[PDB]
Amino acid sequence: RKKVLVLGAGYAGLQTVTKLQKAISTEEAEITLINKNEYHYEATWLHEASAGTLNYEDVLYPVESVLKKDKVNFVQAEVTKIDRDAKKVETNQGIYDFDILVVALGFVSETFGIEGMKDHAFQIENVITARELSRHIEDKFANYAASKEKDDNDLSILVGGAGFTGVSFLGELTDRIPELCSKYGVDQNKVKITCVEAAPKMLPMFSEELVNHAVSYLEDRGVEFKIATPIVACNEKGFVVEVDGEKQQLNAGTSVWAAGVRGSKLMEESFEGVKRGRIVTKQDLTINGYDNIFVIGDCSAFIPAGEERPLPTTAQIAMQQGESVAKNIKRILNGESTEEFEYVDRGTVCSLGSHDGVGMVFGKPIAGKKAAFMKKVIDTRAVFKIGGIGLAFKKGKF
């Protein structure tokens, strides 16, 4: 009975387990799933939980509810060390041995060595960061309303990055901010929402026509964009940016970083050839020198056969990688060879509030209500693909 140890119960990790548990026999292998929290959270919905347009409990479900418990041991613990050669994983709740390992430990914020960006800004990482940020935003409207002398800077919000995560967040803020203005007695004209992006283009994965749609939607709803503008620091007051190479202080009571992510810090400590918590895997999703270790999700850099650059970090690729790993573990267990991973680009949608969005679905571009609808299908399909129709019914977007 070989030991299959899965690290992380995210999109990649939990998908590997819920597929594998259907395939193997109790005599074939023993599965162990280690996760920090008792729940699985929908990281792709953290823009809503962070803005406060959704209750945090709606973006998560208990891990054990989708497990076949005669085949999987759920361990709630934090992975502290991974010994690739000794075949051991240390946690705050004990050491666990392995025959096969699946590293699916996800991502964390990456601030590109920008001084004060982790300390003085709120990140978009998990349910705990989301809860802290939505409460902070509302507390700023509440404290503003409470003060006799009103500082309109308490209501100024800075968002670092105009990519997928940045735009999704701005979209939720445009639904939330009017509601808080009305509740706390504030005029919307006093609220300032500024998106700063160092790159020369916003949402670089989409057409100019789709980006023009996103920009017009957010600009009409009070967002100002400062693109191709580097963020050289973050302090108590807000961000320090360069404009024509001249440092300028931008003030804001809330500074949110959404411009970069990296794989788990455990990656550099545990494996060789790691660049910002990502490891370039072999085509079957194993790592160089270890036919018994798989690294998937945001901890991986899968370069497709014909190409040179790795595919981007997404929950879509993560889930597809987990389905691959589950089949290849069964093949390994039965003395068979592994098959290569082939990513199927079904397209995606960046939300723009509750009733809008920009995306590519079936290879054709989509916007507005059709995008909002398809975003609910993609989000509900991801609950379905891990836990089935009942969980999709209970926790989906329909």
Ligand SMILES: Cc1cc2nc3c(=O)[nH]c(=O)nc-3n(C[C@H](O)[C@H](O)[C@H](O)COP(=O)(O)OP(=O)(O)OC[C@H]3O[C@@H](n4cnc5c(N)ncnc54)[C@H](O)[C@@H]3O)c2cc1C
């Ligand atoms: C707001 C937002 C919107 C996004 N929208 C999209 C979208 O529309 N489509 C899309 O495809 N992608 C989207 N993404 C990207 C997507 O969320 C990630 O690529 C995805 O989360 C990667 O899944 P994963 O399994 O690798 O990691 P994760 O989702 O990060 O899960 C890792 C799990 O491991 C646990 N863990 C981490 N470290 C430890 C440790 N040391 N010990 C134990 N447990 C640990 C975590 O608690 C978590 O349960 C978005 C991301 C964000 C933040």
